C-alpha cells in the first residue's frame, strides 16, 4: 500500500501491442459522413440521472481550441448531433473538390492539417490556407516547419521544433451539474489546458527545453506517441469538479493516465492486442517544483507502479464518476508511506526485473529495466467480481502468533462504532402451545390446601420487566383471538358419560363477558364472527352471542362483579380482567374471582357450562372453589394457552346446578407444579436480555459487536488491525461473524459485526496470551460488499431441529461440571464448543480425528488436543480425567465403521475400562418408550435396529435399554446408571436466548420427541446400584429392591420435578400404588409400585437424621402398545342411527378422530362419530365419506397423534346402495358436481345453486366444517368428479 490504496498481490500488463495504421483521405471522407454507425464522437451518459452531460471527441475534431462561444454550439446532445451532421457535410462537399476522389482517395493525409482545418471551419476562420497542405509529401513534421500558415494560435515553428496547440478532448453540455455520477472531464474542456511540442528526436527537445520555463512540468509519451516524438506541458488551469480538492492541470493528465492504465491492466489476456503497451505519462522536466509531499509527487509514484503492472484491489467503475475520483484522491492523501521499493527519478522509467511489461523489448529509448529491483509477486490479473448486497459470513483462521490481552480491547475501543442502537428482532416465533388437565375419578384426592402457592416476588419490579420484555418480542397475531380459539376448540370436546355427548351442543345461548372492543377496528372480540361462520373445525356455530363488558362497543356496558338484570344463557365464556377493579393487591382480586364465579354460576341455566379467566392463581381461591362450586357441577377442566411468560389460567365447568363429589386430583397437582415451574425458569432466563430498544456499548451481556478500518492495509506490517480483528474474534469467537467491505465518505472501509454471549465471553476467560489470526483470507478480497443494519436477534425463521437438540444436549454437560474437574471429552469437535461451555479453571482434552483450528499457545490453564480415534486402543493409560463425555457422536461412529450399536457400545466401555475416570456421560441411540416415528425428521425401522435421519440422509443403528444395561453392569459392578430426563425442562433453552437464537414452539416439541430416542446416559462408577424387577409398563405392577441401607432411611420419587411419593408417608402418596418392606436379615429395602404415566421417574434417597441427599438411579416406565384392530360388520345402517363398529383398544389410550385438509389437521365432527362402551363407535354414513380419509388419533398426553395415528382405510372402501335414501354433503371447498349414473344434476358449492325438489336438508350438518350443510338425496347412484 502507498498511503491508502490496498493494491493487488498480482502484477499484470498487456502483451501484444496493436500494429499501427496510417490515416488516408478515404478514411477522412468516410468519418465525415457522421453516419448512425460510426460517429467521430462518443456519448457521455450520467450514472445516476441516466442523462447525457458531455461528449468525448475523436479525430478529426481535435482542434477545438478556442472559447466555446465563438463556436456557437447548440445545447442538446441529440440536437448537436444533427447540427454537426449538417455543418460538416459542407466541408465534405468542399474538401473533395480540391482533392478529387478519383486519384486522391488512398493518399497519405496529414492529420495535423486536418484537425486544424476542421477547428478553423467550426470557428468560422480563414480555413482555405490548409487544403494545399492537406496531404503529406515527405514528413508528418518536416512540411509544417515550412509555411507561416493560418492563425498560429494553432501551431507555430520554433526552429526544428513545432509548437502546436493541445486539442480539447471533452465537450461539456448544459445538463452538466457537478453531481457525483456526472463524469469528470479532468480539465480537458476549458479553452487551453496543455501544449504539445513536436519534433523528430528527443535530443532537440532537451535542447529546446534548456530555454523555456518548466514551472509546469513536462510530460512524455515514451511508449507510442499519438502522432510523433513529442513533449507535453499543461497550463495553470485547475480542476474544481472534485470537491473538496483543487487539482492542477498537469495533475489532471497524470490522473487520467494513471487510471486508464490501472483499468487496462485488469482486462489483459495473453492474446488480446492493445493500442499502447503503456499509457501512464512520465514527467521529464520541471520536477524542481514537485515536493516530497505534494499531490503531484504521489501521482508520479502511482504512474510508475501502474506501469509496472500493479493492479488495484479496489474496483474501477466502467464510466468514471466524480465521487469515485474524489474518494481515490483522498485515498492517496492519507497517512502512510510509499511502501514499495519503486522510487521516481528524473532520468527514465525503470522496470522491475520480474515485471510483466515488455516495453524494454518494444521501444528503444527511455526505459531501463533493473536487475536488483524485484517484486516477488505472483503474476496474474484480478478476478472481475460484481457487488454483493448483503454482508458475508466469514471464518477467521488462527496462527500461533500471540499478543497482549490488554492491547486487544484497547484497540477495539479505539476502533468500534459503539455505542449504537440495533433492531431487537423477535425471540420467539411460531404459533401457541396449549396445555390442559381434565378431571378423573381415579386419582388420589388432593385437597385445596396443598396446591402450589404463587411466588411472592411475583410483583417485584424486575419480574415485571421480564414479563414486559418477553411479551414485546412475540411473533403472533391477535392474542385474545388465538386464546379464545384454543379454549373453544378444546371446550367442544368434553363428553358427559351420563348421556354420551358434549355438554357443548349448538344454538346454546352464549354470553361473552368482558367484550373488549380491540382497537383493530372490528369493535368486537375477534373470534365471534369466525365462530358463528363456523370457520372453525370442531366448533359448531351457536344461536347468538351477547357482549357484556366495560369496553364493549357492540353490546352492553356494566360492571359484572355486582348484580345486573339479564336473561339466562346456556354457555358463558369469560375474559374479564381482574387487575382493574379492586386496588393493587391480591386479596381484593381473590374476592373479585369469587364474585365472578358466583355471577357466572347465576347467569348459566341449569345444565349449562362456563369458562372463567384467572389472572392470579392463589391458594384461597381454590379453597373457595372447592368448598363452594365443585359440589355443584358434573365435570371440570383447566386450560392454559402459552403466548407470553405469565400465570394466566382458564377454568371450565360443566353441568351447573347438578350435584356431584368432584374434588381436586393428582393431575391437577402435577399440572400446577409444571405450570409454575416453567414460568419461573422462563422468567429467570428472560431477565438477562438487554432492554427492548436499547443502546449496546459493550457492558450489556448481549450486544452487536462491530469494528471498522478506514483504508485497510493488510499485505505489509500492520500491527494495527492485526490486533484489531483478533480482539473482536477473542471476544465473540465460535459465533457467526459477518463482514462488509465498501466505501464511506471517500474512505475505503471494512466492517466486522458479531454478537457476544456469556459463553463467548467465558471462552475469553480461559486465554492468557491473545491468539492471533492469519489475514490471508481478506487481502484477497477484490469484490465490493454493501454494509447492513445491526439486528440483535437475526434469525427470521425459527431455530432448526438439530441445532436445538445439540443445545439441549450441551446444557446437561455444562450444568454437570463444577470447578476444577479434570475433563476428558471424546468426540470433541474441531471448533471445540467445550472451550466455551465449562469454567475457566478446568483442564480439558480434545479427543477426535480431524485437526482442530483452535490455537495452542494462549491457554491459561491446561488444554490438550489429540489426533486419533476414541474407538481405538492403546492410548488411555496416559490421560487424567474425571468426567468423560460423548455427545451426538457414537451413532455416526458405529455407522461409519460398519459397526453395530451393541459392538460400538461394548468397545467404548472396553476403552474406558482401563482408564482412570470417575463419571461417564454418553449420548446413546436407544429408545425410551414405545417405538414410533417422527414424520420427516427421524424414521425408525423395527426390522433392523436402525434409525434414519432424512434431513441428514443416513442410516444408523441402535440397540435396547436392557441390552445395554448389562454391559455397563459388567465392567462396573458398582455402576449407578441414570437416564436424565429432558422432555419437560426448559432451562436448556438458556443456551439460546443469550446469543439471540430465535426459538419456535414446533422446533421445541420435535426436539423433545427426538430426544425420547436419543437419550443421555449418566453413569457413576461408584454409586449405589438399583435393580429392576417387575414389568415396567403403565397399568402394571412394578417391583424394585434397593440394597445397602438402614430401616431409618427414606426414599422420594420425583417426576417432572414433582414428588410422586416418599416412604415416610406411604399413604398420602401421589402415585396409584406404593409398597415398602425391609429385610432386617440383609438390610435390603423393597418398593413395589404401580405408576400411571409413561416416561421417567427418579428415585432419590435420604440417609440419616440429616438434610443430606443422595441421588440414586432413575428408571423408565413405558406406555402400553400402540396397536389397534377394529371390527366392521356387513350390514350398514345408512339411516340416522348409523352402523356401530368395534375398535379393540387397550383402555389407557383415549381416542378421537381427525381429517387432513390442505395439509392441516381439522377436528372431526363430534356429531358424526360417537365412541362409547368393550368399545363401540357410532357413525352416520354418507357418500362424502368416500372421498375423504379418516384418522383415529390420541389426545391423552399434551401431544396428539404421537402414539396412535390410525387411518380408517376401511371407510374409503364402502359399497353404496342405489335402492336407498342417502345422507350427502360436499367433500371440501373445491367444486364437486353431482352425477346420477354419470349425469350431472347440480353443483355443490356453486354460485347460484338451486335445491332440487326431491333433495332435502338436514338439521345438524355431518360435515367436518360446520359451515357446509348436509342434504338428503333420494335413491340412486351418485358420482362426483373433481374440477
Provide structural commentary.
Interacts with protein mu-NS; in viral inclusions. InterPro entries: Ig-like_fold, Reovirus_L2, Reovirus_L2_4th, Reovirus_L2_6th, Reovirus_L2_7th, Reovirus_L2_8th, Reovirus_L2_GTase, Reovirus_L2_MT1. Outer capsid protein involved in mRNA capping. Catalyzes the last 3 enzymatic activities for formation of the 5' cap structure on the viral plus-strand transcripts, namely the RNA guanylyltransferase, RNA-7N- and RNA-2'O-methyltransferase activities. GO terms for molecular function: ATP binding; GTP binding; mRNA 5'-cap (guanine-N7-)-methyltransferase activity; mRNA guanylyltransferase activity. Keywords: ATP-binding, Capsid protein, GTP-binding, Methyltransferase, mRNA capping, mRNA processing, Multifunctional enzyme, Nucleotide-binding, Nucleotidyltransferase, Outer capsid protein, S-adenosyl-L-methionine, Transferase, Virion. By secondary structure, the protein is of the alpha+beta class. The protein has six domains: 383 residues, no CATH class; 148 residues, no CATH class; 263 residues, no CATH class; 230 residues, no CATH class; 95 residues, no CATH class; 164 residues, no CATH class. The protein has 25 helices and 67 strands. Helix content is 21%, strand content 22%.
The SS-based structural class is alpha+beta
* Domain module tally: 6
The largest sheet is: 7 strands, mixed
Compute the number of helices. 25
The strand line-up of the biggest sheet is 20-27-28-26-25-23-24
The oligomeric state is: part of a larger assembly
C-alpha Rg (nearest Å) = 44 Å
Beginning-to-end CA distance, first to last residue? 71 Å
Helix content: 10-25%
- Secondary structure tally: strands: 67
Amino acid at each position: 500500500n502507498v498511503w491508502g490504496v490496498r493494491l493487488a498481490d498480482s502484477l499484470s500488463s498487456p502483451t501484444i501491442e496493436t500494429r499501427t495504421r496510417q490515416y488516408t483521405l478515404h478514411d477522412l471522407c468516410s468519418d465525415l459522413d457522421a453516419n448512425p454507425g460510426r460517429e467521430p464522437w462518443k456519448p457521455l451518459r450520467n450514472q445516476r440521472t441516466n442523462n447525457i452531460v458531455a461528449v468525448q471527441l475523436f479525430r478529426p475534431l481535435q482542434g477545438l481550441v478556442l472559447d466555446t462561444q465563438l463556436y456557437g454550439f447548440p445545447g442538446a446532445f441529440d440536437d448537436w448531433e444533427r447540427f454537426m451532421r449538417e455543418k460538416l457535410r459542407v466541408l465534405k462537399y468542399e474538401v473533395l473538390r480540391i482533392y478529387p476522389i478519383s486519384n486522391y482517395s488512398n493518399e497519405h493525409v496529414n492529420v495535423f492539417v486536418a484537425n486544424a482545418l476542421v477547428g478553423a471551419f467550426l470557428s468560422n476562420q480563414a480555413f482555405y490556407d490548409l487544403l494545399p497542405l492537406l496531404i503529406i509529401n515527405d514528413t508528418m513534421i518536416g512540411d509544417l516547419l515550412g509555411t507561416g500558415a493560418s492563425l498560429s494560435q494553432f501551431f507555430q515553428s520554433h526552429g526544428d521544433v513545432l509548437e502546436v496547440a493541445a486539442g480539447r478532448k471533452y465537450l461539456q453540455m448544459e445538463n452538466y451539474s457537478n453531481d457525483d455520477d456526472d463524469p469528470p472531464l479532468f480539465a480537458k474542456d476549458l479553452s487551453d489546458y496543455a501544449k504539445a511540442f513536436y519534433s523528430d528526436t528527443y535530443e532537440v527537445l532537451d535542447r529546446f527545453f534548456w530555454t523555456h520555463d518548466s514551472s509546469a512540468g513536462v510530460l512524455v509519451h515514451y511508449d507510442k506517441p499519438t502522432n510523433g516524438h513529442h513533449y507535453l506541458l499543461g497550463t495553470l488551469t485547475q480542476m474544481v469538479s472534485a470537491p473538496p480538492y483543487i487539482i492542477n492541470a498537469t495533475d489532471a493528465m497524470l490522473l487520467e493516465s494513471c487510471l486508464e492504465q490501472f483499468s487496462a491492466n485488469v482486462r489483459a489476456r495473453p492474446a488480446q492486442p492493445v493500442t499502447r503497451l503503456d499509457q501512464c505519462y512520465h514527467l521529464r522536466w520541471g520536477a524542481q517544483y514537485v515536493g516530497e509531499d505534494s499531490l503531484t509527487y504521489r501521482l508520479g509514484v502511482l504512474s510508475l507502479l501502474a506501469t509496472n503492472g500493479y493492479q488495484l484491489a479496489r474496483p474501477i467503475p466502467r464510466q468514471l464518476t466524480n465521487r469515485w475520483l474524489s474518494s481515490f484522491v483522498s485515498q492517496i492523501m492519507s497517512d502512510g508511506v510509499n511502501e514499495t521499493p519503486l522510487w521516481p527519478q528524473e532520468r527514465y522509467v525503470q522496470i522491475a526485473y520480474d515485471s510483466p511489461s515488455v516495453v524494454d523489448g518494444a521501444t528503444q529509448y527511455g526505459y531501463v529495466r533493473k536487475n536488483q529491483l524485484r517484486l516477488g509477486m505472483r503474476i496474474s490479473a484480478l478476478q472481475s467480481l460484481s457487488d454483493t448486497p448483503s454482508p458475508v459470513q466469514w471464518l477467521p483462521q488462527y496462527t500461533i502468533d500471540q499478543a497482549a490481552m490488554d492491547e486487544g480491547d484497547l484497540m477495539v475501543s479505539r476502533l468500534t462504532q459503539l455505542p449504537l442502537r440495533p433492531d431487537y428482532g423477535n425471540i420467539w416465533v411460531g404459533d401457541a402451545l396449549s396445555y390442559y388437565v381434565d378431571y378423573n375419578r381415579s386419582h388420589r384426592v388432593v385437597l385445596s390446601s396443598e396446591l402450589p402457592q404463587l411466588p411472592d416476588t411475583y410483583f417485584d419490579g424486575d419480574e415485571q420487566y421480564g414479563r414486559s420484555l418477553f411479551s414485546l418480542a412475540r411473533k403472533i397475531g391477535d392474542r385474545s383471538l388465538v386464546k379464545d380459539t384454543a379454549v373453544l376448540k378444546h371446550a367442544y370436546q368434553a363428553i358427559d358419560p351420563n348421556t354420551g355427548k358434549e355438554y357443548l351442543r349448538s344454538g346454546q345461548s352464549v354470553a361473552y363477558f368482558g367484550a373488549s372492543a380491540g382497537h383493530s377496528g372490528a369493535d368486537q372480540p375477534l373470534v365471534i364472527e369466525p365462530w358463528i361462520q363456523g370457520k372453525i373445525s370442531g366448533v359448531p356455530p351457536p344461536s347468538s352471542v351477547r357482549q357484556f363488558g366495560y369496553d364493549v362497543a357492540r353490546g352492553a356496558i356494566v360492571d359484572l362483579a355486582r348484580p345486573f338484570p339479564s336473561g339466562d344463557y346456556q354457555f358463558v365464556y369469560s375474559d374479564v380482567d381482574q387487575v382493574v377493579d379492586g386496588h393493587d393487591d391480591l386479596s381484593i382480586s381473590s374476592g373479585l374471582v369469587e364474585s365472578l364465579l358466583s355471577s357466572c354460576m347465576h347467569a348459566t341455566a341449569p345444565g349449562g357450562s362456563f369458562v372463567v379467566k384467572i389472572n392470579f392463581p392463589t391458594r384461597p381461591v381454590w379453597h373457595y372453589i372447592e368448598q363452594k362450586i365443585l359440589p355443584n357441577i358434573t365435570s371440570y377442566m383447566l386450560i392454559k394457552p402459552f403466548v407470553t411468560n405469565n400465570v394466566e389460567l382458564f377454568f371450565v365447568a360443566f353441568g351447573v346446578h347438578q350435584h356431584s363429589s368432584l374434588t381436586w386430583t393428582s393431575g391437577v397437582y402435577f399440572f400446577l407444579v409444571d405450570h409454575f415451574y416453567r414460568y419461573e425458569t422462563l422468567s429467570t432466563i428472560s431477565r438477562q436480555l438487554p432492554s427492548f430498544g436499547y443502546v449496546d456499548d459493550g457492558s450489556s451481556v448481549t450486544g452487536i459487536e462491530t469494528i471498522s478500518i478506514e483504508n485497510p492495509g493488510f499485505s505489509n506490517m500492520t500491527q494495527a488491525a492485526r490486533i484489531g480483528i483478533s480482539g473482536l474474534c477473542a471476544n465473540v469467537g465460535n459465533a457467526r461473524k459477518s463482514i462488509a467491505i465498501y466505501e464511506s465518505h471517500g474512505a475505503r472501509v471494512l466492517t466486522i459485526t458479531s454478537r457476544r454471549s456469556p459463553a463467548s465471553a467465558r471462552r475469553k476467560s480461559r486465554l492468557r496470551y491473545l491468539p492471533l489470526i492469519d489475514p490471508r483470507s481478506l487481502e484477497v478480497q477484490a469484490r465490493t460488499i454493501l454494509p447492513a443494519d445491526p439486528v440483535l436477534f437475526e434469525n427470521v425463521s425459527g431455530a432448526s431441529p438439530h441445532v436445538c437438540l445439540t443445545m439441549m444436549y450441551n446444557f446437561e454437560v455444562s450444568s454437570a461440571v463444577y470447578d476444577g474437574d479434570v475433563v476428558l471429552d471424546l468426540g470433541t469437535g474441531p471448533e471445540a464448543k467445550i472451550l466455551e461451555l465449562i469454567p475457566a479453571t478446568s483442564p480439558v482434552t480434545c479427543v477426535d480425528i480431524r485437526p482442530t483450528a483452535q490455537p495452542s499457545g494462549c491457554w491459561n490453564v491446561r488444554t490438550t488436543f489429540l489426533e486419533l480415534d476414541y474407538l481405538s486402543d492403546g492410548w488411555i493409560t496416559g490421560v487424567r480425567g474425571d468426567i468423560v463425555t460423548c455427545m451426538l457422536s457414537l451413532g455416526a461412529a458405529a455407522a461409519g465403521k460398519s459397526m453395530t450399536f451393541d459392538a460400538a457400545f461394548q468397545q467404548l466401555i472396553k476403552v474406558l475400562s482401563k482408564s482412570t475416570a470417575n463419571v461417564v456421560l454418553v449420548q446413546v441411540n436407544c429408545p425410551t418408550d414405545v417405538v414410533r416415528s417422527i414424520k420427516g425428521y427421524l424414521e425408525i425401522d423395527s426390522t433392523n435396529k436402525r434409525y434414519r435421519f432424512p434431513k441428514f440422509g443416513r442410516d444408523e443403528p441402535y440397540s435396547d435399554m436392557d441390552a445395554l444395561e448389562k454391559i455397563c453392569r459388567t465392567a462396573w459392578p458398582n455402576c449407578s446408571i441414570t437416564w436424565v430426563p429432558l422432555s419437560y425442562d426448559l432451562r436448556w433453552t438458556r443456551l439460546a436466548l443469550l446469543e439471540s437464537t430465535t426459538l419456535s414452539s414446533a422446533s421445541i416439541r420435535i426436539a423433545e420427541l427426538m430426544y425420547k430416542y436419543m437419550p443421555i446416559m449418566r453413569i457413576d462408577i461408584h454409586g449405589l446400584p438399583m435393580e429392576k424387577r417387575g414389568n415396567f409398563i403403565v397399568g402394571q405392577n412394578c417391583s424394585l429392591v434397593i440394597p445397602g441401607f438402614n430401616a431409618q432411611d427414606v426414599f422420594n420419587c420425583y417426576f417432572n420435578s414433582a414428588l410422586a411419593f416418599s416412604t415416610e408417608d406411604v399413604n398420602a402418596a401421589m402415585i396409584p400404588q406404593v409398597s415398602a418392606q425391609f429385610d432386617a436379615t440383609k438390610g435390603e429395602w423393597t418398593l413395589d409400585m404401580v405408576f400411571s404415566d409413561a416416561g421417567i421417574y427418579t428415585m432419590q434417597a435420604l440417609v440419616g437424621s440429616n438434610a443430606n441427599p443422595v441421588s440414586l438411579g432413575s428408571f423408565v416406565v413405558d406406555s402400553p402398545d400402540v396397536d389397534i384392530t377394529d371390527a366392521w360388520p356387513a350390514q350398514l345402517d345408512f339411516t340416522i342411527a348409523g352402523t356401530d363398529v368395534d375398535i379393540t383398544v387397550n383402555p389407557y389410550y383415549r381416542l378421537m378422530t381427525f381429517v387432513r385438509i390442505d395439509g392441516q389437521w381439522q377436528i372431526a365432527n363430534p356429531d358424526k362419530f360417537q365412541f362409547f362402551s368393550t368399545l363401540v363407535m357410532n357413525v352416520k354414513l354418507d357418500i362424502a365419506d368416500k372421498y375423504l380419509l379418516y384418522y383415529i388419533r390420541d389426545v391423552q398426553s399434551r401431544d396428539v397423534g404421537f402414539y396412535i395415528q390410525h387411518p380408517l382405510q376401511l371407510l374409503n372402501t364402502i359399497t353404496l346402495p342405489t335402492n336407498e335414501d342417502l345422507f350427502l354433503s360436499a367433500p371440501d371447498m373445491r367444486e364437486w358436481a353431482v352425477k346420477e349414473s354419470g349425469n350431472t344434476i347440480c353443483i355443490l358449492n356453486s354460485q347460484g345453486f338451486v335445491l332440487p325438489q326431491d333433495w332435502d336438508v338436514l338439521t345438524d350438518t355431518i360435515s367436518w366444517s360446520p359451515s357446509i350443510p348436509t342434504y338428503i338425496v333420494p335413491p340412486g347412484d351418485y358420482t362426483l368428479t373433481p374440477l
